[PDB]
Amino acid sequence: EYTLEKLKDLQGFYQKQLLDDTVPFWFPRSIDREFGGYLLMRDQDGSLIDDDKAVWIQGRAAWLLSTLYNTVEQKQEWLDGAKSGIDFLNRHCFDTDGQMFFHVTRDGQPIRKRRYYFSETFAVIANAAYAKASGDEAAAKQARYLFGKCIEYSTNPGTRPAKGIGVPMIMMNTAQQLRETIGDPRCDEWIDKWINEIETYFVKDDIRCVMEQVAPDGSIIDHIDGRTLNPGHAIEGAWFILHEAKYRNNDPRLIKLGCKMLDYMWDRGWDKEHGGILYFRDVYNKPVQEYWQDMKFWWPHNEVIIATLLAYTITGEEKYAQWHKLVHEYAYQHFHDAANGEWFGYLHKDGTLAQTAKGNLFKGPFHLPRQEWYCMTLLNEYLQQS
Amino acid sequence: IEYTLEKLKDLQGFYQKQLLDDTVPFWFPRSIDREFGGYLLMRDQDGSLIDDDKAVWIQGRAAWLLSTLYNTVEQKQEWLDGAKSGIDFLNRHCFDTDGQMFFHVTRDGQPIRKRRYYFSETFAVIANAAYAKASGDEAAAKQARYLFGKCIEYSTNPGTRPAKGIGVPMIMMNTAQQLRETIGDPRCDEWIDKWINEIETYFVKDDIRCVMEQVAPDGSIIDHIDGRTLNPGHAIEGAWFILHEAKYRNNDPRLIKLGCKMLDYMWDRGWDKEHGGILYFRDVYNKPVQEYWQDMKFWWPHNEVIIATLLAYTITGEEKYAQWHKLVHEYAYQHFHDAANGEWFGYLHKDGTLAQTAKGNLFKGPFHLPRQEWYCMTLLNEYLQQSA
Ligand SMILES: [Cl-]
Numbered sequence: 001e002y003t004l005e006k007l008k009d010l011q012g013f014y015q016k017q018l019l020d021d022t023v024p025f026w027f028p029r030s031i032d033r034e035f036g037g038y039l040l041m042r043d044q045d046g047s048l049i050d051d052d053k054a055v056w057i058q059g060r061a062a063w064l065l066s067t068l069y070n071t072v073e074q075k076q077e078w079l080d081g082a083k084s085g086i087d088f089l090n091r092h093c094f095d096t097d098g099q100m101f102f103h104v105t106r107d108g109q110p111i112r113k114r115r116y117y118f119s120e121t122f123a124v125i126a127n128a129a130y131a132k133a134s135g136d137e138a139a140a141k142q143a144r145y146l147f148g149k150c151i152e153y154s155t156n157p158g159t160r161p162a163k164g165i166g167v168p169m170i171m172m173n174t175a176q177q178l179r180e181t182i183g184d185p186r187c188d189e190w191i192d193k194w195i196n197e198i199e200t201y202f203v204k205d206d207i208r209c210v211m212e213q214v215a216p217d218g219s220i221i222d223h224i225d226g227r228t229l230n231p232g233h234a235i236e237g238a239w240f241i242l243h244e245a246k247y248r249n250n251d252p253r254l255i256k257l258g259c260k261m262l263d264y265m266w267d268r269g270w271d272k273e274h275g276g277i278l279y280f281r282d283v284y285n286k287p288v289q290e291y292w293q294d295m296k297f298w299w300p301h302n303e304v305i306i307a308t309l310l311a312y313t314i315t316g317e318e319k320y321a322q323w324h325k326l327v328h329e330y331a332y333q334h335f336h337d338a339a340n341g342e343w344f345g346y347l348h349k350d351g352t353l354a355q356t357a358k359g360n361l362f363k364g365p366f367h368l369p370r371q372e373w374y375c376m377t378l379l380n381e382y383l384q385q386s
Numbered sequence: 387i388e389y390t391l392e393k394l395k396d397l398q399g400f401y402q403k404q405l406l407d408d409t410v411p412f413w414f415p416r417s418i419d420r421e422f423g424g425y426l427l428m429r430d431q432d433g434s435l436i437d438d439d440k441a442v443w444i445q446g447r448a449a450w451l452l453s454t455l456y457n458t459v460e461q462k463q464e465w466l467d468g469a470k471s472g473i474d475f476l477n478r479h480c481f482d483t484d485g486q487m488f489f490h491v492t493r494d495g496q497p498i499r500k501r502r503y504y505f506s507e508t509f510a511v512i513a514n515a516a517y518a519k520a521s522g523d524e525a526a527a528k529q530a531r532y533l534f535g536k537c538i539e540y541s542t543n544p545g546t547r548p549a550k551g552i553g554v555p556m557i558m559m560n561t562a563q564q565l566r567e568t569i570g571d572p573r574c575d576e577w578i579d580k581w582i583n584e585i586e587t588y589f590v591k592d593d594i595r596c597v598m599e600q601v602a603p604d605g606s607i608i609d610h611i612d613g614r615t616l617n618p619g620h621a622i623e624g625a626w627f628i629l630h631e632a633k634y635r636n637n638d639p640r641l642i643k644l645g646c647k648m649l650d651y652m653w654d655r656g657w658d659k660e661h662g663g664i665l666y667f668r669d670v671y672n673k674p675v676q677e678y679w680q681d682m683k684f685w686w687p688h689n690e691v692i693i694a695t696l697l698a699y700t701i702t703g704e705e706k707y708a709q710w711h712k713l714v715h716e717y718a719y720q721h722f723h724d725a726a727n728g729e730w731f732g733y734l735h736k737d738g739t740l741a742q743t744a745k746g747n748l749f750k751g752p753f754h755l756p757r758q759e760w761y762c763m764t765l766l767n768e769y770l771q772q773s774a
């Protein structure tokens with residue numbers, strides 16, 4: 001079982017990993033002193049495999065540095081490092097039509113633009129956290145302006161229409177971060193709408209599943225893409241909802257919703273043969289066609305670590321402590337690089353390493369440091385209440 | 387020493403029997419959609435459907451195969467009728483109002499996705515050309531020749547980091563070869579020459595013994611994640627297209643040397659010395675490859691390397707190509723072929739264990755494998771006739 005003694009040990013473990021292993025792998029060496037932003041596409045030993053810049057990750061990194069400054073320690077280099085990324089986003093990462101790029105060169109020239117606005121949402125949370133850390137009013141205004149645009153995008157968009165869970169999920173966490181940094185009067189009412197959308201359309205109690213995509217009326221699309229599940233993604237949404245429950249004084253309705261989602265997708269996603277969270281599953285257990293479906297990626301493990309620990313501290317249910325122990329031990333034993341620090345991203349189904357890089361177009365200083373920071377902070381609060 | 391004439395005769399019979407008694411019957415006639423036309427090809431290991439959608443490229447590839455079997459193996463009416471069903475489905479449902487082809491449609495032909503490629507059109511060219519030869523349908527011949535010109539058009543003028551890809555000259559070369567070998571077109575030979583020259587000039591790097599997938603417009607290597615990424619099976623597919631052309635051109639020594647060089651370079655980079663088989667992606671400077679499936683063992687690179695090694699052996703007589711053919715043939719038939727239900731699995735982990743059980747989807751269908759068995763059966767029949 002998870003005694004207060006063991007929870008105190010876990011608190012110190014996550015704090016030590018965050019501050020002595022994870023953050024120093026990236027900072028300050030990744031700050032680009034010549035062009036601004038961050039050089040983050042790094043191999044296992046920290047050497048660069050590319051000098052390109054992933055726009056989402058630039059925003060995520062500035063958000064992380066600002067959040068550490070705000071909640072851990074007011075280190076000037078973290079603040080300066082956050083401003084570097086904010087300035088790079090503003091100077092180089094917007095196209096002439098007002099939408100953000102996805103992928104740019106070291107010096108800010110565009111490589112690719114996507115038809116999502118997830119770039120904008122990471123700019124919101126970056127500017128919001130930076131505004132609180134620095135008191136920069138231009139950043140606070142920018143965060144609220146971009147948030148209103150994302151709200152428009154989300155509501156005012158072949159023969160098989162689908163809606164995806166990713167939009168309400170990302171909008172929910174964006175609004176949570178805005179609320180918790182500088183505030184915005186629109187956050188709570190829109191969070192309510194996005195939780196309702198998740199519960200109404202994507203959570204299926206009869207078959208104990210959380211869908212990634214459904215038809216506009218909520219029905220399951222019985223085709224290869226429509227059947228494809230992402231357990232780690234669903235469980236990320238579950239802990240966003242549990243976080244909201246805590247914020248609303250441990251709202252039992254939201255606790256029930258988040259816990260169901262976790263229960264459903266733990267059962268579907270945990271690999272009983274090798275351990276770990278499988279990347280994709282199929283709602284009807286048909287063979288999954290996306291090639292990396294049985295690989296073990298870092299970030300589903302980060303999100304399930306958060307969700308199980310948060311479910312445990314809220315409900316006291318021993319099964320969530322059991323699941324936390326399983327995923328925590330699996331992840332730190334398989335992904336963490338004891339020699340050079342930080343985590344590998346990509347393992348085969350059997351847990352062996354597929355390739356050595358620690359940063360690329362998708363991985364950087366976000367899912368892992370957020371998990372270590374959130375768990376350290378959560379357990380600090382929990383143990384101050386006991 | 388490696389391969390005697392008797393052994394080559396046994397191999398010819400193997401590829402022939404696998405093609406006609408195992409591979410083709412897994413798919414046909416049961417996949418012909420009598421109600422809506424075209425083919426239901428997204429099947430699990432036991433042949434049951436996992437989806438009733440239709441991948442437009444694969445509809446064209448399957449109609450090409452059925453017509454080719456009709457023209458070169460046996461004039462079975464069921465194959466002709468089956469080819470016609472795919473041609474008709476393409477014409478009735480797979481073209482948008484602007485003349486461009488869709489990529490992915492429903493069972494009843496409604497559009498799901500349209501891609502900016504013209505690859506879909508190249509598979510309509512080869513399907514219509516083969517079908518025209520089989521049936522004498524003049525409209526199919528006219529369509530194949532018209533669309534071939536449209537593909538040439540796009541190929542000449544196909545974004546701060548411009549890049550050129552080897553797939554364009556490769557797919558255009560094979561399209562032109564198939565047009566030549568079915569109904570004929572006066573443009574084929576000159577354009578094949580241009581596409582071979584493009585491959586040699588821009589993509590084959592002799593100093594580092596590599597064939598690139600993409601390069602900058604002047605041929606320089608793009609030293610970023612995507613630009614460094616190599617696909618050994620794709621390069622070796624291009625190598626055998628070139629060796630095929632060498633034979634047509636009266637065993638042109640320049641083309642033989644070029645195709646063999648490409649094969650040699652990418653066998654060395656692509657063969658997995660630890661677990662066996664051809665790796666899907668590599669990096670030109672041996673940096674870690676970022677695409678997630680880089681170390682998986684897919685069916686189709688093995689089909690293309692089986693062709694290339696056997697073709698190179700028959701042309702050059704170099705025993706190393708027989709050695710490599712034996713290695714990849716034994717590896718692929720032992721790991722991918724499903725002796726219980728027929729046909730081949732598509733997707734293995736690096737270590738050769740099965741990743742999932744499906745035999746058709748948006749990308750796999752009756753194309754790379756039956757083309758390999760048909761090409762090898764045919765090549766060996768011709769070779770053994772010469773050795774008598
Ligand atoms: Cl990340």
Ligand SMILES: [Cl-]
Pocket residue numbers: 686749750751752753754755
């Ligand atoms: Cl195929």
